[PDB]
Design a protein around this ligand. Structure first.
Ligand SMILES: C[As](C)(=O)[O-]
Ligand SMILES: [Ca+2]
Ligand SMILES: [Ca+2]
Ligand SMILES: [Ca+2]
Lengths: 108, 108
């Protein structure tokens, strides 16, 4: 099953970032990170992100190579990342704080 | 009721970090964080935390002040921290991954 939370940023909270986690693999869906990651690469200011602007596959190749992001692949060919890299990206982008309020303790 | 999870670190798994949550307040016990927090402050390397040491109240004052940690107090005078502060500290110490199975997304 999929587990999902969304938060918003930008001066008018119009830029979404969705964390989509697969319950079986524990991985996060890569696609949701790409518009913000590309804007960060281009100008260093994620508040400028156009959320409708998605990198082409050619642009995605260059982002994965530059940031040293490894991906897992599902049966349909869609790309996912590990929790550890997800957290590293949130911290790089200064977005951990935006998601602090999204987690709840569950006694294993 | 109290809910608890413990994980270990250091070269011989000799350093414990215990998360103790009160299910009525949602807060976590402060004291368990102090040995690792003091070591992080001193050398930035938590893997060299001395399992034998425990910070005095005077040392505790300094850590709470420096890291800007607010505390809640119970009827016995024991000190507790908020869920969001617990998450912030795990992130800062790069221990969120270690406790990943103890945290899930909020309900939508
Ligand atoms: C909450 As207690 C009295 O076990 O430190
Ligand atoms: Ca993708
Ligand atoms: Ca919440
Ligand atoms: Ca204490």
């Amino acid at each position: 099953a999929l587990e999902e939370v969304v938060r918003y940023l930008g001066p008018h909270n119009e830029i979404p970032l969705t964390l989509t986690r697969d319950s079986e693999t524990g991985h996060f869906l890569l696609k949701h990170f790409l518009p913000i990651l590309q804007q960060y690469h281009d100008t260093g200011n994620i508040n400028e992100t156009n959320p409708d602007s998605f990198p082409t596959d050619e642009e995605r190749n260059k982002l994965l190579a530059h940031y040293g992001i490894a991906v897992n692949t599902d049966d349909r060919g869609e790309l996912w990342i590990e929790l550890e890299k997800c957290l590293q990206l949130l911290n790089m982008l200064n977005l951990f704080g935006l998601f602090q309020d999204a987690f709840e303790f569950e006694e294993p």
